C-alpha cells in the first residue's frame, strides 16, 4: 500500500535517529578543552595574479603545488605558474559560461563545465604546441556545478539535474550514475584514496557515495539550507560542509553524525568555499563579505581573517604541501596568501 | 633570470597582449537575456527575428556596428536561484509573455509571478526590462466568447472585443515593477511582425542613454 511506504520510512528514520543518538558519549568540544589554541595567525598576499577581465568562478591547484588553473566568465581558462606569476596557457573556451574547473592529478589534462551541460576536457601536453579539446562529455540535463579528476581516464561530475556521474574519458559515456538527491548538487570532493566521495545538495544534505559499488552509503543532514561547498579532512574519516546559513559544519563518517559547528553571530552571509589545511587544524572558509575566515577545526574558535578582496570570494584552494592558500573573488583577482 | 625564464616571460607577455585584445573585442558587444515563460512561443519568435536580416544558447545579431547576444536559457532544471547571478552585467532582460493564455489552467498568473520574481532579484538593478506580448492576433480572434471578466477580477472595461484587454493585461504586467527607478519597454508582438529587432535596438539605445545620463553627472 501507499501508506505502508510512509509508515516504514518514518519507522526507519526514527530508528536511525535513536541509533545515532545512542552512540553519543560526549561532544568534540569537551574532549578538546585541554588543547592549547592556535592563537592568532596573520597571512599576507605574497602574489597577485591579474590577467582575468571578469569574475573568477573556479580554481584548482596542481599536484606539484606550483601550477594552478582558473576559469573566468570572459571565456578564458588561464594556467598560472604561481611561483613567478607567469602565464603558461590561456585556453579559449567554446561557451563562456563556466561554473567549475579541474586540474588532472598527473598534470596532463584540465576540465571545465558550465551552463552548456557539457564537460570539456583539454589536453595540455601533446605535440603541435596547441591545447585542443580532447573530449566533450555531454550526458547531463543541468548546469555542471563541480568536476574532479579521478584518474587520467576517469572523471566524476555533479550536475544541477540532481545527479552525479562517473565518466570514462576514453569511451566518453557514463559508467555509473549516482541518483539519490532531491535538489541540485552544488559541490563534490573526492577521498584521499579516491574510493569514496561525498556530494552536498540544495536540500540540506550530504551523501557518501561508493565509486566502485555505485550506491549511497550514508546520508548526513544537519544544515538548514543549501550546501554550497564541501571538503575532506586529510585523514579521510571526516568532512566539512559550508552552507547559506553562515554556518560551517564538520561531520564524521564512522560516528555517522555531526561533530562540530562553526557559527559566529557577526557573519550572516552564505559560505562559498571551504577547505582544510595540510594537518587538518585550520579551516579556510570563503564568505560573501569578501573576506576569508580561518576557523580552528578542533576548538571552533575563529583565529584569523583574510580581507584583501573587493568582491565576494568564489573559489579557494590549499596546496598539497600546505605552503600557500589561493583565493579567487568576483573582481578578476586571485591572491596567494602565505 | 636564466636564458629560458626570459622566454617564459616573453610568452606570458604575448598571452597577456592577446588577452587584452580579446577583452576589448568582448567589451564592444552587448548581452541581452531572453526569458520565455511557459508555452509563450519563443522558438518562432527567435526564428522570425533571425530570418529577417538579423543547453544554453546564444544568438548573435550584428546591428549597425553593434553586436547583441540573445542569451537564451532553454532547458534548465536548476530552479534559477543558482545560475542567475551569472547574468549580473546584462544590459536588459527580454521577458516574453503570451497574450492568448488568460484561459489556460491560471497560466497568466504564473507568468506574472515569474515576472515579479525575476524583476525583484538584486542582480538586475542596472538593467531594464523589455516586455514582449506575443500572440496578439490569436488574442484578437480569442477575445470573443472568452469574457475575461470572470478569469481576472475587475476588468472594469467592456465585455467585448475592444482592445482594452491588451491594455489591461499590460497594466497588470507593468504594475509589478518597483516604482520610479526602472522603466519597462513594453511592445505588442505578433507572430508575423518585422519591427521586433528595431524595437530591441531602440530599447537598448534608450537604456544605454539613460545609464549615460546617470553616470556623466548630467542628471
Amino acid at each position, epitope marked *: 500500500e501507499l501508506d505502508q511506504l510512509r509508515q516504514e520510512a518514518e519507522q526507519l528514520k526514527n530508528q536511525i535517529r535513536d541509533a545515532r543518538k545512542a552512540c553519543a558519549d560526549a561532544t568534540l568540544s569537551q574532549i578538546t578543552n585541554n588543547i592549547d589554541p592556535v592563537g592568532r595567525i596573520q597571512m599576507r598576499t605574497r602574489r597577485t595574479l591579474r590577467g582575468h577581465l571578469a569574475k573568477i568562478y573556479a580554481m584548482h591547484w596542481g599536484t606539484d603545488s606550483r*601550477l594552478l588553473v582558473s576559469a573566468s566568465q570572459d571565456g578564458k581558462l588561464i594556467i598560472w605558474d604561481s611561483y613567478t606569476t*607567469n602565464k*603558461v596557457h590561456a585556453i579559449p573556451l567554446r561557451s563562456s559560461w563556466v561554473m567549475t574547473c579541474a586540474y588532472a592529478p598527473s598534470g596532463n589534462y584540465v576540465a571545465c563545465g558550465g551552463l552548456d551541460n557539457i564537460c570539456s576536457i583539454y589536453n595540455l601536453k601533446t605535440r603541435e604546441g*596547441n591545447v585542443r579539446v580532447s573530449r566533450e562529455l555531454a550526458g547531463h540535463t543541468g548546469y555542471l556545478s563541480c568536476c574532479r579528476f579521478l584518474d587520467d581516464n576517469q572523471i566524476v561530475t555533479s550536475s544541477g539535474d540532481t545527479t552525479c556521474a562517473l565518466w570514462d574519458i576514453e569511451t566518453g559515456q557514463q559508467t555509473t550514475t549516482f541518483t539519490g538527491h532531491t535538489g541540485d548538487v552544488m559541490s563534490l570532493s573526492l577521498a584521499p584514496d579516491t574510493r569514496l566521495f561525498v556530494s552536498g545538495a540544495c536540500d540540506a544534505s550530504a551523501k557518501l557515495w561508493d565509486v566502485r559499488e555505485g550506491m549511497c552509503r550514508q546520508t548526513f543532514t544537519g544544515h538548514e539550507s543549501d550546501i554550497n561547498a564541501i571538503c575532506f579532512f586529510p585523514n579521510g574519516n571526516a568532512f566539512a560542509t559550508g552552507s547559506d546559513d553562515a554556518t560551517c559544519r564538520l561531520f564524521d563518517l564512522r560516528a555517522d553524525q555531526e561533530l562540530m559547528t562553526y557559527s559566529h553571530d557577526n557573519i550572516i552571509c552564505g559560505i562559498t568555499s571551504v577547505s582544510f589545511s595540510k594537518s587538518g587544524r585550520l579551516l579556510l572558509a570563503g564568505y560573501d563579505d569578501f573576506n576569508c575566515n580561518v576557523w580552528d577545526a578542533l576548538k571552533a574558535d575563529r583565529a584569523g581573517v583574510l580581507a584583501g578582496h573587493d568582491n565576494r570570494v568564489s573559489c579557494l584552494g590549499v596546496t598539497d604541501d600546505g605552503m600557500a592558500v589561493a583565493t579567487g573573488s568576483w573582481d578578476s583577482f586571485l591572491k596567494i596568501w602565505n | 633570470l636564466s636564458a629560458e625564464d626570459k*622566454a617564459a616571460v616573453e610568452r606570458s607577455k604575448m598571452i597577456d597582449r592577446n588577452l587584452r585584445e580579446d577583452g576589448e573585442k568582448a567589451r564592444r558587444e552587448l548581452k541581452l537575456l531572453l526569458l520565455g515563460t511557459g508555452e509563450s512561443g519563443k522558438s518562432t519568435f527567435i526564428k522570425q527575428m533571425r530570418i529577417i536580416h538579423g543547453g544554453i544558447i546564444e544568438y548573435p545579431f550584428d546591428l549597425q556596428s553593434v553586436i547583441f547576444r540573445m542569451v537564451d536559457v532553454g532547458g534548465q532544471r536548476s530552479e534559477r536561484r543558482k545560475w542567475i547571478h551569472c547574468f549580473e552585467n546584462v544590459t536588459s532582460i527580454m521577458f516574453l509573455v503570451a497574450l492568448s493564455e488568460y484561459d489556460q489552467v491560471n497560466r497568466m498568473e504564473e507568468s506574472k509571478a515569474l515576472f515579479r520574481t525575476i524583476i525583484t532579484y538584486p542582480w538586475f538593478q542596472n538593467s531594464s526590462v523589455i516586455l514582449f506580448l506575443n500572440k496578439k492576433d490569436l488574442l484578437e480572434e480569442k477575445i470573443m466568447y472568452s469574457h475575461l471578466v470572470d478569469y481576472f477580477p475587475e476588468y472594469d472595461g467592456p465585455q467585448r472585443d475592444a482592445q482594452a484587454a491588451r491594455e489591461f493585461i499590460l497594466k497588470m504586467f507593468v504594475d509589478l515593477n518597483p516604482d520610479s527607478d526602472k522603466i519597462i519597454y513594453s511592445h505588442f508582438t505578433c507572430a508575423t511582425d518585422t519591427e521586433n529587432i528595431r524595437f530591441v535596438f531602440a530599447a537598448v539605445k534608450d537604456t544605454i542613454l539613460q545609464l549615460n545620463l546617470k553616470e556623466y553627472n548630467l542628471v
Partner: single-chain antibody
Amino acid sequence: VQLVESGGGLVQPGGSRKLSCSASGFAFSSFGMHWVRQAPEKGLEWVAYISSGSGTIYYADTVKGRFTISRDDPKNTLFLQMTSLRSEDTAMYYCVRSIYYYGSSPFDFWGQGTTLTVSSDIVMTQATSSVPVTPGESVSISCRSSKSLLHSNGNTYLYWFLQRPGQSPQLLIYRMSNLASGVPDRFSGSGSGTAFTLTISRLEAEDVGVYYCMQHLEYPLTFGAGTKLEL
C-alpha cells in the same frame, strides 16, 4: 610536426643566398626557431635564434653582422638571409623548433637540412672520443662544463642529443634529468655541477651514433665535441 629546408647548392665565395624552411603540422606562430649548423665532419654549433613574435633575436659571433633571420607566420616559413659567404660556411644547416614555458622540452624536434658548398663562451668538452659498446651492456657517457650550469632556480640546463648515421639528431634528455617523449626508458641522466653523465641500460639496436651535450645558459649555445659509440 614536419620541417623541410630549401636552398643550398654550390656558391662562389662572397655571394649572397637565402635559406627557406617550411613548417607544417604544428602551431608555428607559437614556437621559437633556431638555425644550428654542422660542418662536414665536426660537431654542431648554434648560428641564429628568433623567438615567437620576432621580439627577440640572437646570433653567434662567427655569423654576427653578415646574417639576417626572419619568419613569415601566415605562410609558415622561416628565412635566413646570408651575405658574403666565406669558405668556413660549407655546412649542412638544420632548423630546430623550441617552446619555452614551465615544464616544456625545447629543442625537441629537429628537421632535415640543406647542404651548401662555398668553394666569454662556455667551452663544453667530452674527452671521450669513442667508447666501445656491446649490445645488452650498460654504458656511460661523460660531459664536462667550464662553469657551473646549476642556476639559482635549481634548473641545470644540460641537453643530450643523439645523431644516427645519415639522419637528424633528436632530443634524448632535457635539463639532464627529464626523459623526452618517445624515448625508451632505458636512457637516463644524472650528474653534479660541471660533471654530467648519461647512462644506457640494455643497449639495443639503432643506438649507434654520436652524442652531444649542449648548454642553455647565456645564448652562445655551445654543443659538445661528440662521442661515437662504435661496435
